[PDB]
Amino acid sequence: GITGTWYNQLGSTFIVTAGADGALTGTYESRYVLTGRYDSAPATDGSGTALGWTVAWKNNYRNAHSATTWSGQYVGGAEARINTQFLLTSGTTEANAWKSTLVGHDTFTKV
Amino acid sequence: GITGTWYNQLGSTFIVTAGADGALTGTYESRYVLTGRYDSAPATDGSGTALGWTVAWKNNYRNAHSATTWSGQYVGGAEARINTQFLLTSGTTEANAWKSTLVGHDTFTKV
Amino acid sequence: GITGTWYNQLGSTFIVTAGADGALTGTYESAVGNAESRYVLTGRYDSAPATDGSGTALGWTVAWKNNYRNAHSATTWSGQYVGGAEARINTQFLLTSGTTEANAWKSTLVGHDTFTKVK
Amino acid sequence: GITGTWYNQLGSTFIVTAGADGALTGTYENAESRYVLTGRYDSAPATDGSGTALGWTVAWKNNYRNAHSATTWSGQYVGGAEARINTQFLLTSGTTEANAWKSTLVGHDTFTKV
């Protein structure tokens, strides 16, 4: 139930393919390459499915010298969702290294 | 460069290949598949190179039902360093989700 | 505006007073974790925030020791108050447990809490 | 072992007093660089060699300056010769709703008696 199109509440879109080898591949909409990993054999006791992915914010058109990683879980059901916390790291000089990383969270629905 | 064998303070071992257009692939070590991305065209001003990667903690011997993502930057220097912050998420029930995610930091060197 | 009784989405209660010195004092009751009854909190807040529609930065700490139990840990919430039709305090938290050096790598939990004046 | 003066490696200092029941009060630092702190610590920690859980907050406003922000530090004290306080922090800035997603920085810092 992870494969498909997911939306957060701020207009972002990601299209992911969940591989039988536990790979997560896809696109984060401009448009960037996404890549990560998920638990391909989760428990069936009500627990969600742990997963994570990364996007580096460079494509053919632009480059923000930064990258975001999302760490969370997939919860299936009537209203399937992916609940995440993220770290967004920017390339800084070592003087500014303490202020390099933002932390936040985001929920995705199949909306 | 980024490509190489890296070690953290706790003795972990991280083997990466940095690809031509932003891919990170390799193994984390009990050896697990990692995947990520990096800024393939960083600043020329002394800024570091932003990157991130994910490991899902299942292999052909163990499954902890959890995933860790690392977000950081590569600093090229006399000692080349990769400085990160990580999020380790565990599959929980949604009543336990509040204690699902650990946060910490890690520094890798080629030594 | 911050002074009042606040509840999170889990049923916990946050009774606080915002003083004029930027101080925050009060009591926290958690609905989850190793805890029971009330614990003391203290923190700080921006007593003169920007006029441009931004919110009010604040933070506080609870050490989870009271007369009923000791979880050997503390939590800090960091966030901002947003005054509006639906007044709300949005935070992120760090919960640190005392550990030995060996497991300090797993001493800290991070999550996010939203508080509202209506339960 | 907590009461006193602590230093990080980026040229910052805090002076704390740890009161008998888990209170922490002090200053984070010239006058224009001085700010008030307050937090709590576990006043009856385990004797198993585990550290002492603590946390504190500084809002970045004093009599001269206002950064419209607050940092909370969450961590543990470890006694001994190299007495250390190991923390992770969260630094939140007041933003607009639109930019709340970029309001909070996360990082780590270590404090020593020397």
From Swiss-Prot, chain C:
Function: The biological function of streptavidin is not known. Forms a strong non-covalent specific complex with biotin (one molecule of biotin per subunit of streptavidin).
Molecular function per GO: biotin binding
Cysteine pairings via disulfide bonds: none
Record bears the keyword rRNA-binding: no
Gene Ontology CC annotations of this record: extracellular region
UniProt keyword DNA repair, yes or no: no
Subunit structure: Homotetramer.
Family statement drawn from the similarity comment of this UniProt entry: Belongs to the avidin/streptavidin family.
Entire protein: shown range: 40 to 158 of 183
UniProt keyword annotations, A-Z: Biotin, Secreted, Signal
Name of the protein: Streptavidin
Domain of life: Bacteria
Domain (Avidin-like): residue spans on this chain: 1-119
Location relative to the cell: Secreted
Motif Cell attachment site per UniProt: ranges: 44-46
Residues the record lists as binding biotin: Y28, Y39, W77, F93, W105
